A paper describes a structure:
Ae. aegypti OBP22 (AeOBP22) is a member of the OBP family of proteins that has been directly implicated in regulating these feeding behaviors. AeOBP22 is unusual in that it is expressed in multiple chemosensory tissues, including in the antenna, the proboscis of the females, the thoracic spiracles, in the male reproductive glands where it is transferred to the females during mating, and in the salivary glands. The monomeric forms of AeOBP22 are similar to other classical OBPs which consist of six α-helices stabilized by three disulfide bridges surrounding a hydrophobic pocket. Our results provide evidence that fatty acids are likely natural ligands for AeOBP22 and that the binding of long-chain fatty acids (C15-C20) is enhanced by a conformational change in the C-terminal tail that is critical to generate a high affinity binding site.
The third crystal form grows in the presence of cadmium and/or cobalt ions in the C121 space group and contains only monomers. Structures of the apo-state and the complexes formed with linoleic acid (C18:2) and AA (C20:4) were solved using cobalt SAD methods and refined to a resolution of 1.85 Å. In the bound state, AeOBP22 is unusual in that it contains a seventh C-terminal α-helix that forms one edge of the ligand-binding pocket. Small differences are seen in the position of helix-7, which rotates out slightly from the binding pocket in the presence of larger fatty acids such that the Cα at Ile120 is approximately 2 Å displaced from its position with shorter chain fatty acids. The NMR structure of the AeOBP22-AA complex superimposes with the crystal structure with an RMSD of 0.67 Å for the backbone atoms of residues 7–120 and confirms that the monomeric structure observed in the crystal is maintained in solution. The biggest differences between the structure are in the conformation of the loop between helices 4 and 5, which are involved in crystal packing, but which are dynamic in solution. The overall structure of the arachidonic acid ligand is similar to the structure observed in the crystal. However, even in the crystal there are differences in the ligand position in the two monomers in the asymmetric unit. However, the extent of unsaturation also impacts the affinity, with the more rigid AA (C20:4) having a lower affinity than the monounsaturated C20:1.
Residue numbers in the entry: 2 to 121
Amino acid sequence: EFTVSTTEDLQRYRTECVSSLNIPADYVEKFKKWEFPEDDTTMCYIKCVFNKMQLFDDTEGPLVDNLVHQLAHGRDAEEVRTEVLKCVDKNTDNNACHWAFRGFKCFQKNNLSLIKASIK
Ligand SMILES: CCCCC/C=C\C/C=C\C/C=C\C/C=C\CCCC(=O)O
Ligand SMILES: [Co+2]
Ligand SMILES: [Co+2]
């Protein structure tokens, strides 16, 4: 049921989320440059994209098995899973947007290369 996301999948999901959340043009400009402001508009966008990629569920949180499928082929699944699990936490402030974004920010600090490589 999980399918890995390609570059085109991700571009479609970006477009869909910009549409459905009515993301302002200024934010889109920033997302294109990999700039993600610390605000609800951005956080809900990332949640939206992750929902569509089947990498995050609003109730269960990060979908670790799916993240490993997305990121790890050709690499050491154990290493990747370990790095993912370091960024997996509880929904302590009962906010799926905050939750999804926190995990993204955690992971991309040290694993940006792995993220970019996953999108072929
Ligand atoms: C437990 C924390 C897990 C966080 C994992 C981080 C990223 C997901 C991993 C692989 C999927 C690849 C790209 C999606 C990443 C960011 C959204 C792009 C937004 C945009 O470009 O407009
Ligand atoms: Co797999
Ligand atoms: Co392990």
